[PDB]
Every structure is written in structure tokens, then in C-alpha cells.
Symmetry: D2
Subunit: 373 residues, 4 copies
């Protein structure tokens, strides 16, 4: 089998099939005609992501939320139950609790790392088990293989949001997951210029999602133009993730030596709670770092406002380094003790480590750390 | 208030606000940063404001597709126990969404003739939350009395949603007739060049805000690409000129078909024989570019007609510069059987034409030639 | 033979040969393995519209002009030009190729006697625009062509003002036609592009020499696709530009503040007859002169609220310029007239917006001036 | 000063100035009302990477080269050229500007004594590539710059092969640098573009003369945006290109079918020392000569399954070419020799694919070349 990098560049395409074009032409057309009485650009992206993820088929959508909703609207119906990881991406949480959850679908959050508890929460109604790994809060890891075994016993469908790792660092399908969902807007695109989502899994499941969730319940159609840009980004996925991870590791070790830092959440540190599990499922620790300042919410606010290279934003996986402090940002409306509920610390700061020179990033952080004193 | 053409070209944008750029720059960025610890795309926002102006509404919302607009709207407005009244015939995928989608999540569905104001009111219940229909409706251009149902909906407290794809704001403005919301498959006439897929919702700020923050944000994620939104605005700049041409060509072709021996019946709002001729002229400033007619030869003449076309393309879509034609019996519903189609109001010889922008003489010759071949 | 509108939409493309795609896929690729189909389609379609054998697509109007002349001329060669030319074209001939041993001479392309007297054995090319930027000055294309053949010179006409929809120089004897597709062809002011249409022999030479080696004015497939998109409504847009322009022109002709009007659609137009012989419609460009001179023109411009103050034309948006206070803010009354640039000359690129809105803007500005 | 990668991603742009947009909006507009921002950002960024004062963006590498030379030269002037040049550049000089009174002379830019001896009061420009396509022949940039400075000649270096990440001629004395951004800068083979970087004085002249009036090789803003996108991973891509090429070069050097191999990264490379003095890494291009001559080459090329048979380089996909049976197929064996092109010469633009896959393809094709 050709290597990952080779497939990310060539899988599913032969220039001789399109007039010798080295780069596939963009099928920016809404409709196709018939000689007598699917979009190729999108089909290539899908086959390529399926190949990288180690799955039978792929589906491309307008956004990560488009992929999540199309998938869940397809697999769930009133009466069905869905077990969820204890923490989820903001909009995913809203979708479940304020969306499909208000339509007769039962929801329940369980620690996906606690196989005992998971086995206990299972019921004959449990139709889907959905979670992210690592999870948005403090990189909580889930035992994918362990969860898949239980799910396989009860006949439940396992859906894993693999946004953070990408197929390059983790492949849940190879660990038992039935479906993998991605916000391709992040690492896959890698350049923060498109919004897109991806679904990969068995031909049977993906066909259903395509013809039901996407076609009829969301209409989250991805533009061929953006699909092309996404494939452009995927061509450097391995190289970009290597740098993201190498930069993050150095930055994490630097932060671990800071007096002002109380706690550090990074899979690459030996003191990481689930260090062993992470290494079992991930080939590299990732480009995301979560940490807490001893000064609480005030220290985080000052740290954030002093950053000059890092950007204050909510996304991740871009060439540019990004930082966010939920306490004084996304969750600024949530009162102190109230904020703690969602697991958000008052001094919790999350960094999406970019591709810029590491010493420049270390210098920005060092400089900002001084301003949060 | 400036004229329609003027607003379709200028509304919401002043070059002086973006370094003098005559054409607004495309914000192809997924994220925006903040200067301090304490989010909408300018390209989509312009598109939305412009469509709101054209439709005469308070606010607009842009989505990845027409279905994205329809699903985001309905997922927002409906919850189990709610009832939605539907026009008797709907777009294939919309019907599917309703009966195999949201309808399977506890929402009650009921089809009613939206042209029959008495029947519609008779179907109103305290659970009725939404009234949804297309006008004209896909099958045979059946019209709905928009102002009429709007009055009823107002007396019973239901939200009126009209799919205005076929007419576009240039030919019909439901919001001005009393509708609360209008949805569009911008993929059709608005884009006008068949190169993008997009949807639009226009209505009150209250309703659109909810759809944006609920349906779109959490339930569909049908986000429109800034690149496509820019192309959509490019297409809208010639909307009046294109619709004028689509209609002029369609009227000519319609009057032609009405004189052909192979044609059994014709459904075109512009012909005096159209059953709802009077209602149509009251809601539409022009008869449209869509023609539906039936061949006497049945499903055989249809297939023959379709295969003989040289200029018109055999495809399932409409509103493109290129003329398109389709025969449901031998295309979209071919799988089904005569009875099946009969039930859905689809005759064996029903052919639908989306009259394009090419030379009418070339169009007439293509249809003439294909009609002869339908023998 | 399909009509113009039909060809502008279908010529050279059949979905069957591209997986059924109604709209041709965009070949955004720098190279191929073992000519770009998107550019070829655009070229083939433009050739059909202009009625020529071959077409060539370039990065800009200037790319088309330079690539053409760089190919056809060499030191010692002589080129005859119309008395007036687009600013950058003038700069190119006099400050560019004219500085590499190529001889230049301007002649009134409407005065056949003068053109024949200006012809020499060294005359290799005859280049001009028609109508000509200044005040719509027309050139007798068929007439200049007859002289060119007799002498064996190549006739190149810049046809961006009319577009193949209103005028086709090739059918009047021209050998090559050049366009700033940036204008009316695109029609939406979002791309910069150039087009050359002519015989296969001439175009092949320009492609392989001027473009490939001397300018590198390569058009992006993305922009070529947008250009074809614009071309699909060319007939409709030009119809409206002309209809709007005629109304505005007749209006200006009744206003006291206006001393003179330059519009082919008015019977008073000096070359009315010739114009109607080469152009199917009078066009969407209007040039007129205010009585108040540069001061009035300046007041007129600053008062405009719908028309935009910019230098370009052929856009959906109406545009206006006053050379004396804009492109020629420099100079003085002398040099101005030295180039036929009246102190009160205002040029309008009449857009597609509602004629009532356009009239209101012009009326208000007209009052504002004076 | 921030590092190269940091500048490749951030230089010249601050989100705050554009509504907080992380990625700068694309100014896809032909005109402005009362200098394209997208093009300006690309230019300022390229200038920073190359360590120059200003940059200019054009439609293609040839647009950059022609705009540059058309501006700096005039009849009577002389230009000294490296011995071997890119195909189209050679054609531009000999069949283009060289036919307009400009004197041309080829000199080995590695031989400083010959260079000095070739200097004349008429020498206005010294143009060359380094490495030079053929066999990666290097030029002593600082050496030639010192000479040009003494005589007052402008030094222009085509730096596309190395990119600013591996070599910065400006820092070595060159006055101007040109790039076919279509290659490594873009890195994904989907756009055609050129870049010129140098002093504000030289770049201003090239923009207002060469480009504006003599070539019109304008770059599409959409393409400039894609180019900036590619530049954000330049360092990462070049590191991989170089790593893969080194391994492939060392492999090829040990193969029986290989008679001569040209890769700057091999200790035995003739100008190994000079190369390392100017380039931070040996590059992703490899040229080698097969023993079986033209027949072996054609055999080798047809057997390739991963490498694509094409004429270009700097793409994520590996590309290979055999001049004798491809671009130079029409010449005679002697004519090719005259240009330093062996009948068995094969050039490889090593891509980003997995090295083990690249090795297997080359190995397998090597056996078939027999």
C-alpha cells in the first residue's frame, strides 16, 4: 500500500483520465445532463479521505456541524437513545440538547474512558454512542477499542469526532469505530479559508447519511470550489501536523516549567493522566495545548490580551497560532462557579499551536506570561 | 426607493467603505479574530441584505443550498406536537424531508389545496404552527392565493413560508402579500448560470434570527461558501434582464406548443387558457420561464421527444442560461409505475421545460424537430 | 447557423464530453502530463462571436495589444495609428516598442485619402479603435482594409467598446481584433482579461511568440471561466446599456448646461451614417461637454451619487469621469486641447441600473454644476 | 526580526485592519472608485522573504522576466547571460528582445575572469539562473555582483529553483530576483504566476513600464491569494522536497544504469562548496544521465508509474522529463549536445510523496530502461 503522503496527494486520481491535467479540474456545476432519457470533485475528496481514514466510503459536507447533524439525523429517531462523551464541542452540545434532543431522542452523558460505567448505561434503546477524542475540555481520552467492543455487543453505532487528530494521527475506524466525523474547516484544510465537514465509514452507513441526512434533512452541500481547496490542504497534511506537534511539544514543555502555570493538559507530557492510552491511539500528541494560570480568570484575560503573535480566536488547526480563554471569552457570560460546571476552569487557556517559528511563539508566550503577573 | 435593477446591483454596498473597490472583496475566511478578549461574514451579510431588499423583507440568511434553507427554516419553527399544512404538491426533496424526515420526529403533516381558502381554514387547528407551499407548484404550475392564506394564517396564528424559487423577487414578492418567510433555491434563477448551489431565506428579523441561530447554526450546518455567495451576487446583478428574456422566450414557446397536434394540454401562466390566469397575473408581474405540457403519445412520445432534443439539455434543474427539459415518467419517476405517478399527479406524457436564454428561433426549431420525432 | 445568444452560451461545448457537466469544469492546473481546455473554450467561443478563425485569451487588454504588436513588428517596420488611442496603448507605442526601432505615425482613420498618402513600403501594421476614446470618432474599417490589402499591411482593430455583439471588424476586412475583456465582455468589473481574434495563421504566431516569449500575459483559468459566465448575458446587457444610453443621451441633448453631445445614436452625430454601417446599436458610452468648463465638470462629478467616479467602462455599475480633473488632473488648458480633451468633457459609461434612477442622478448633478 | 516561517505566514497583514478576518479578503475587482490590496500583500510578503525592498506580482514567470528586461534594456544595450537558460527565456532573448537591437552574449557566471573580460561599457544587465537547469551549474553570485557593481550593471537572478527559503541572491549582491511562482512558491501546480523582487527604484520602473505598458501580464487576485496560501507551507514543503531528493540522489548514484548524476547534495558535486555557500539546502531537483542514451530514456519515462511525465517542477506530485524525447525531441543529437543535453539526460522534480514509493518507482523504471 502506498504511504500516507502518497495517497493524500494521488489517491483516486489519474491525470490520463482528465486530458492529462496534473491537478483535477473543478466541477463547479450544479447539474449534470444525460445522453438519453454525483460531483466528481466531491467524489475525489471523499475517496481520498476514506483512504486516509482507512474506511470504505466518505461524504463531504458544507461544515463539521453539517457532518455531525447529517449523521445523527440519519441514525436516530424518537425513542432511540444516544450516549455522549461527558464534554462536547459547543455547537454539538447545543444540537443534541436543543435540537434533536427536543424531538424525542434520548440523551445521556457518560465517561467514555470508564468502560464499567459505559457498559452500565447501555440499554436496548441505545442506538448511537458519540464522542470526541481527545475531548475539547482538557484532552480527555476515550477507550475507542473498549467502547467499540461494548457497542458491538449491544449492536450500537459508534461515531467518533476525529477533528483534533485527523487521519494522520489517529484512525478510530481501525480501532472499531463505525463512523468518523470531521470539521475539515480545521486541520484538514489547515489554512482557515474554507468551511467543510467530512464523514467516513462503511458504504452502508455513508450511503444512508448521503441519501437521508444530507440530501433531505440538512442540505449541507459543500462547494466544489471549497472541496478543491480542501484537497489542496490535505496534500500537506502530514507535513503540517508534524510541525504542529513538534511546536506544541516544545511549547508544552516550556509551559510546564512556568511558575505561573498551575496545570497543563497536553498528551505529550509524561505526567498526562491518560498518557498510555493516548500513545496507544495517537501516533503523535497533537497541536493543541490546554493549561491553567494560577491567577484564575484575571490572569488568563491579561495573558490573552498581551499576546502579539498568537491570535485571539475560537478556531484551531490553522497555519496561524490561535488562543482562547473560555472564561473571559466564549463562556464570559457563564458566572464563576456556574462556568465550572461545563468543566471550564477560570484560568483555562487553550492554544492551537501554529506553524510559525517556535522561538517566536515561545517569545510571545513568555512575554504575555509576564503581563499576566 | 431606487428601482429593482439598481438595488440588485448596489444595495448595501458603497465602494468608499472598502478602499474604493467597485466589487466588494470576498471574505474567504473561516474565522475572525478579536482585538481583545471581549461573528458574521461580510460577504454573506451583503448577499443577505441585498436579497432582503429585493424581496421587501427585513432580513436575509444565506445557506449552502435550497434544501439547506428549507430544512433550517422548518427545523427551527417546528417541534413534536406541532402541525404543518403543506401545498398538495412539493419539490421532490422537500416532500421527502417532510414525510421521511421531520415528519418522522413527531411533527404532524397534512396536505391541503392552498388555492382553496375554505379547505385551508377548515384544516387550521390550534396545533397548526406553519403553512408551507410553493407557488407556482412544480407539477403543473398550480397557484396559491398568497394574500388569502396569509389572512387566514394571521387569524389563526400560523407562520407562512413560501418557496419563491420559480418566480424570484423580480416576478413575485410573497412577503408583500402577507407571507412571513420566503425561501429560495438560489441554485436556480438567482444564480442564473448553473455554477453554484445555494439557498436563501428572507423574512422578519425575529424569524430569520431564530433560523440563523437555531436551524442553521445547530441543526443543519448548511453554511454557504463566501466564494459561491460572491458568484450569486454576480448573478443577481443581471436578474431582471435574464428573467425578462426567460419569460419572453417562454411565452413564444408556449403559444407555439398550443398549436401543435402532438400536444394534448399545456400549463403556462401566460396563456389565457391557464385555469388560474387571473390569480397568476395578480401575484406575478410576468408569467415565468417554466412550461409544462403533455404529449398525446404518452410515456413513449415523451422518451422520444426527450431523446430528440439537440439544444435543450436532458437534465433535472432549472433557471440556467441553458434551456433544460425533463420527462418525470422516463426520468425522475421512471422507477415507479403508471399508477404511482398518477397518484402523485404526474401524467405519462408530462414534459417540463425550463426555457433558457438562447435565440428563440433556435429553441423553436429544437422543439419543432423533437415534436416531429415524438411520432 | 445558431443565433448570437445561442452561441455565446453553447459554442464549443457539449456536456457529454465532460461527464454530463452542464457548466464546463475549470482546469485550474498549471500543467498537463502524458493547451488548457478552459482557455481554449473561451477562445473558440470568442472566435465564433467575432466571426474569426481563431482566438487567444490573455491576462489583460494590454496583454492582448502588446502580445499582438510585439509579434507583428520589428525594427524598421512602420505602424499607422488612429489619431487617438487608449492611454496605456499610446504609452506602449511611444514609450515602449516605439523605442525599439519601430516607426510610428498617427493618421485620421476616417480620412482614406490621408491614410493612402501615409502608406509606405515599410507600413506593416494599421492599428486603431472604433469608436475612438476621445469623442466616438469612427473609422471606415472596410475602407482602411481595402488600402491595407493593396499594400499588404495587417489591420488590427480594438473592438472593446462595441463587443462582437454590436460590431465585428473582421467581417469588414480587419485581420485581427483585440479586446479588453475586462470591460463589457466580463461586464461585472471583477476580472482583468484580454482577447485576440483573427486568422489561425496570425493568432498562432501571436500565441507562440508575443505571448509565450515576449509578454507572458497568461490568463488564469478561474478568470477565463468568469469571463465566459459574463459572456452568456452579453447580448442582454448590451441591449440594456444601449437602451439606457440612448435615453440619457436624448435627455442631455435637451439640457441647457450641455453645449455639445458625443453619442452615435443621435442624428447630429458627425459620422451618423458610417456609425450605423458598422454598429448594430449606438453603444453604452456617452461623452458630452458642460458649458462651465473644468469647474462645472468638477462640480458635476462631485455631485454624482449613483454614478461612480472611476476610470473604466462596461460594468453593470454606471461610471463617470472628467479627464480635465481626473486622468488629466495635470496638464493645462493647452495640453488638454492639445489632445482634444475639452475642459468640460465628461464621459459616461452607462450602466444597467434603472433608467429613472440614472436620469435623476444626472439631473441633480447637472444642477449642482453650473 | 521574526523567523522565515512566521513571516511567510504573517508578514504585512494584521487581521484588525480587515474586520478581524484571519485570512485577508480577496480583492477580485478590476477597478477602484474615488493598487490592488491582495496583490500588494503578496508583493510585500515576497519582498520580506527575499530580503528585498519591494516586490511585484505578475501573471507568470515569463511575465516577470519579460517585464523586467523590457524595462531595463534598449537598443544598443548589451546583456550578459548565463550559458544555459530556461527554454522560453532563451527564446525571448534570441527571438524576441534580441531582435530589437539589444546585444546578447553568453558567459559562464562561475568563471569570474571570463565575466570581467566580457564586460563592456554597453553592458547594462547580467542575467542568469543558479542553479542552471542543465546540470545544476552554479554561479558565483557575490563574485558576479562585485564585478557588475564596478561596471555599473544591473544583476538579475532567476531564483525559482531555490526559492527565498533556500537562497537569497539579493543578500549576495544581486539587484533583482525573478521567480516562476508557478513552481515551488505555489507548490501545488494549480496557478501560473511570477514575482519580481528588488530595490524600490528598480521595481517601481518595472511596474510602471515593463508591466503596465509592455506586457500587461497582470496576476489574477484569486491566483495571488492561492499563491499566498501555498507560501504558508513553503519551508515545510522545501524541507521535504530536499529530504526526498537527497535519498533519491544517493540511490541513483549507486545504480549501474546511471553514468552521470547531478545533485548539489552529493559530496562529489563539482561545485559542492560554492553551492553550500549560497544554498541552505541542496534542493528538490535531480538530473542524471542514463547509459543507454535516448532509447534508455524513453524506456525509463514510459515505465514510470508514480512520477508523472510532464514539463514543470516544484509541485507536490513528483515529475520527470527526458528532453531528448520530449521538449527537445525535434533537435538533432548534436544540437542537444550543443546545449549540454545528453541523449540520456533525465530530470526529476522530486515531490512530497512517501520516499519508499518514489524509490520503488525509480528502481522499477531503471530496470525497464535496459
Amino acid at each position: 500500500l502506498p504511504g500516507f503522503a502518497t495517497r493524500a496527494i494521488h489517491h483516486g486520481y489519474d491525470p490520463q483520465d482528465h486530458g492529462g491535467a496534473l491537478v483535477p479540474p473543478v466541477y463547479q456545476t450544479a447539474t449534470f445532463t444525460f445522453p438519453t432519457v454525483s460531483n466528481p470533485t466531491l467524489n475525489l475528496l471523499e475517496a481520498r479521505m476514506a483512504s486516509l481514514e482507512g474506511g470504505e466510503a466518505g461524504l463531504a459536507l458544507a461544515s463539521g456541524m453539517g457532518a455531525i447533524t447529517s449523521t445523527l439525523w440519519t441514525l436516530l429517531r424518537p425513542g432511540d437513545e444516544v450516549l455522549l462523551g461527558n464534554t462536547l464541542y459547543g455547537c454539538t452540545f447545543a444540537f443534541l440538547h436543543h435540537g434533536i434532543g427536543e424531538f424525542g431522542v434520548k440523551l445521556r452523558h457518560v465517561d467514555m474512558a470508564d468502560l464499567q460505567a459505559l457498559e452500565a448505561a447501555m440499554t436496548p434503546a441505545t442506538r448511537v454512542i458519540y464522542f470526541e477524542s481527545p475531548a475539547n475540555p482538557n484532552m480527555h481520552m476515550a477507550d475507542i477499542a473498549g467502547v467499540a467492543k461494548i457497542a458491538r455487543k449491544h449492536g450500537a453505532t459508534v461515531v467518533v469526532d476525529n477533528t483534533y487528530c485527523t487521519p494522520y494521527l489517529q484512525r478510530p475506524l481501525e480501532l472499531g469505530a463505525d463512523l468518523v466525523v470531521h470539521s475539515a474547516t480545521k486541520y484538514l484544510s489547515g489554512h482557515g479559508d474554507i468551511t467543510a465537514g467530512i464523514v467516513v465509514g462503511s458504504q452502508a452507513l455513508v450511503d444512508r447519511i448521503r441519501l437521508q441526512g444530507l440530501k433531505d434533512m440538512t442540505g449541507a452541500v459543500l462547494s466544489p470550489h471549497d472541496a478543491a481547496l480542501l484537497m489542496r490542504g490535505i496534500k500537506t497534511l502530514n507535513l503540517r501536523m508534524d510541525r504542529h506537534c513538534a511546536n506544541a511539544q516544545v511549547l508544552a514543555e516550556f509551559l510546564a516549567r512556568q511558575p505561573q502555570v498551575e496545570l497543563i493538559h497536553y498528551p505529550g507530557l509524561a505526567s498526562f493522566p491518560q498518557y498510555t492510552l493516548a500513545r496507544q491511539q495517537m501516533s503523535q500528541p497533537g497541536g493543541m495545548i490546554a493549561f491553567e494560570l494560577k491567577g484564575g480568570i484575571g490572569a488568563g484575560r491579561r495573558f490573552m490580551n498581551a499576546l502579539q503573535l498568537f491570535s485571539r480566536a475560537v478556531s484551531l488547526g490553522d497555519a496561524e497560532s490561535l488562543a482562547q480563554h473560555p472564561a473571559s471569552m466564549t463562556h464570559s457570560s457563564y458566572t464563576p462557579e456556574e462556568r465550572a460546571h461545563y468543566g471550564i476552569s477560570e484560568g483555562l487557556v487553550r492554544l492551537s499551536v501554529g506553524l510559525e517559528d517556535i522561538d517566536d511563539l515561545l517569545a510571545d508566550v513568555q512575554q504575555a506570561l509576564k503581563a499576566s503577573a
